[PDB]
Amino acid sequence: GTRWAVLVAGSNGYENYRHQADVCHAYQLLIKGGLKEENIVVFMYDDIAWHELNPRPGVIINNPRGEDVYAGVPKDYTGEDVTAENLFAVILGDRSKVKGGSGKVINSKPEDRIFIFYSNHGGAGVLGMPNEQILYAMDFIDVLKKKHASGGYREMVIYVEACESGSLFEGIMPKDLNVFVTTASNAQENSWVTYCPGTEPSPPPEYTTCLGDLYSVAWMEDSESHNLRRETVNQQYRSVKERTSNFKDYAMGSHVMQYGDTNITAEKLYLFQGFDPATVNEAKMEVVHQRDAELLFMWQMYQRSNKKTHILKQIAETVKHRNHLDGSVELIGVLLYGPGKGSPVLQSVRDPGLPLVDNWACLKSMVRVFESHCGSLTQYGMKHMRAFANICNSGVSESSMEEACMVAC
Amino acid sequence: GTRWAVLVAGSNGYENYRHQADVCHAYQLLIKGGLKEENIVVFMYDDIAWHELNPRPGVIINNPRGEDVYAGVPKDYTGEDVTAENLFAVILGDRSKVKGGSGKVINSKPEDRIFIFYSNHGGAGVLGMPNEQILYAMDFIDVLKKKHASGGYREMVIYVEACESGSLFEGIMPKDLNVFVTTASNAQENSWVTYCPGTEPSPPPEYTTCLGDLYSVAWMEDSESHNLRRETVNQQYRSVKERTSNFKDYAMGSHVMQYGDTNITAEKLYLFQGFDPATVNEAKMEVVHQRDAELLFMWQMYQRSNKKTHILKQIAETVKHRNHLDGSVELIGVLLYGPGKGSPVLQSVRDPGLPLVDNWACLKSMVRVFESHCGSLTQYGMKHMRAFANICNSGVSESSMEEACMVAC
Numbered sequence A, B: 001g002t003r004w005a006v007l008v009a010g011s012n013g014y015e016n017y018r019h020q021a022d023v024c025h026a027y028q029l030l031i032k033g034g035l036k037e038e039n040i041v042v043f044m045y046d047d048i049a050w051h052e053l054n055p056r057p058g059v060i061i062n063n064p065r066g067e068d069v070y071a072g073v074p075k076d077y078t079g080e081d082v083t084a085e086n087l088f089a090v091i092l093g094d095r096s097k098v099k100g101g102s103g104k105v106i107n108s109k110p111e112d113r114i115f116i117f118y119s120n121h122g123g124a125g126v127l128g129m130p131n132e133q134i135l136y137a138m139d140f141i142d143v144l145k146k147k148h149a150s151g152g153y154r155e156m157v158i159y160v161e162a163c164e165s166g167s168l169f170e171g172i173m174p175k176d177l178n179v180f181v182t183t184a185s186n187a188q189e190n191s192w193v194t195y196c197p198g199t200e201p202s203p204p205p206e207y208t209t210c211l212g213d214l215y216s217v218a219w220m221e222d223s224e225s226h227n228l229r230r231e232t233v234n235q236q237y238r239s240v241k242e243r244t245s246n247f248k249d250y251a252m253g254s255h256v257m258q259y260g261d262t263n264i265t266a267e268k269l270y271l272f273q274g275f276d277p278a279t280v281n282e283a284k285m286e287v288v289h290q291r292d293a294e295l296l297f298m299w300q301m302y303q304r305s306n307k308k309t310h311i312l313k314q315i316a317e318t319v320k321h322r323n324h325l326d327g328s329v330e331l332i333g334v335l336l337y338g339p340g341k342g343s344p345v346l347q348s349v350r351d352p353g354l355p356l357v358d359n360w361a362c363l364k365s366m367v368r369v370f371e372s373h374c375g376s377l378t379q380y381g382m383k384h385m386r387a388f389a390n391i392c393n394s395g396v397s398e399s400s401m402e403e404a405c406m407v408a409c
């Protein structure tokens, strides 16, 4: 059969360099293993390589050894074409449902295998897509069920790098889809960022933005340092789990989770990632929170400048925007449930194995009502997704949500 | 000698019923023990007994058994006269430095004893006074040193009911003043509120506001249930400590602390609180945070109404005001120290036994700069006092504080 891949960075902006850095590295890794470019679909906004802030124009690196991963990466879905609708259409393999981009899709055969890697921001039940778009977990599950029902592949492996990424599959990912999944974190942890300005191991001094993400570089640097005809999917999961746990210090690391068909863990990794003919034959990392890396970048910029006050006022606006969202959400909880019960309700985490939300259509509706009244969530606002899900689960009506949002905003 | 007392409620508003309820109960307790009215100075705003919301006009109660404590309480310093300046002047006993009120002061003799009880809101190093006034711990210490240096008393006992009230004395209260102090909480805990609408033990159903404060009713109900010619100061401290710890559950209770001259703990309580001739011869309480009781009261009102939306919009404004203060302070930390270090700096608590702040004049200056730019702190904003103290201790200049406050506000 034929090995296919879909690589997605869900973010843009130079502050988010790392997510397209991850995706570009994954592309070069798969090419080195003998996957063909026509079978690898790359979603990247593509604003990094030639960004005015990039100290190495035309180059993207993904770890402090500084090897370029940008050259040769195809422009399949870039800019405005990096959408959930295009991602869903690529996975289904129906070129007629794609809007824009190259038209490359996963029009795979029943004997083929597929490898999907996503890297950016997220929250409970949701994944980010560039310019304020949100991808809801259940729609992603639905695409996998549809693809499976059309006999489009033999097996699939999915790696997801994002905050709270366990919540995209817990209680909803079927095990009969020949799909195996791992996530950087459990349903409630955040995801961690590595190779940042000011940490060890040191990125090259000219960089003001972080180079990679902990779970992502963990699996990629593990793959490229091993013979993939011998390493199993399970061995990579084990190695990635230990490295991402960062010496089992969950204040500085997270729990890598697995979902779906665990029988796939017995398979050799080359069936999914190819094999590199040259591969024949640790310290605690200083990491930062995915949600904190943006401000660390603006602060790196502030400290290195002389317009110095323009950056500061932009830091002020960013924090103030976050405070507005955090407060609006907290106040909605107060108006709906009272003080002393609003935060318990909004912030309670369901037991592992249960779905985040019982009505996914309600979740989208609460987000819609919120944003109509309180403004756009942004990428940062996905941190409030569990709060909206908990409003849904509480049986509070959409009519009462409307009233609370109008009072709050 | 003669026994004197000063009783202070630092708050006003029907939401804060309990603080004047505490003070009124303490007054009746001391009269029953034979202290004379001319030797007891009462500071209470006096907006409770005849408040339009008071279901028992002319009556104040301090626990669910519903006995009035208001009748007979003198009007020494009420309304606009409840000030730190008047409190300091009362304690010093110089009637000429009082502004307004009755003119009653503690013009005590070297053989006299003094008992001081304060009950309301506070924060690190500060106590509230009605209508946005703040009383700074070191000014209170200075008054005690001045009073001591004039030979004004033999011994003094001080009870303080307020958030973070340990911080008013740690590292600054001398032990050579013949003054013994206990506080409802340590330097970082909040203070707890008892007998609230919706908790057990049940206040009479018509009340929408909490009746008392945990540490305050603990010492008063302990005094009135014992023979004070036999009970020692130490025994009351022990009993109050255990009751305020609420089964040693510090998520629902606090650590009562002691400062000053601990030799006074060996003395019989009647020397300070008098003795009642009739006294010849437990469940975990449901309590709420001092800072949370205001919103619980507005919510009780919301739930019992039909203007129903007027109250809600007032709840919204209260939460939004708090969010503005919390965000402004957090942003000032970000601008001064960077993200990832602003909160560690602003929220770090010094080791027990050290003073909250090294330059008390700087603390007042930071508050001044903040309020000029970001608006009044309010009573709620004393929760940010440790943040301002930590800015002072960090050596950040007043010039840099000004710049950060202008960017932030």
Ligand SMILES: *[C@@H]1O[C@H](CO)[C@@H](O)[C@H](O)[C@H]1NC(C)=O
Binding pocket: A175, A176, A260, A261, A262, A263
């Ligand atoms: C994995 O395959 C085994 C066959 O040995 C089967 O018993 C089991 O049900 C399968 N598990 C899943 C999750 O499909």
Ligand SMILES: *[C@@H]1O[C@H](CO)[C@@H](O)[C@H](O)[C@H]1NC(C)=O
Binding pocket: B175, B176, B260, B261, B262, B263
């Ligand atoms: C208490 O009095 C004793 C005398 O027995 C003395 O040793 C001690 O220093 C005194 N403590 C304080 C805090 O004044």
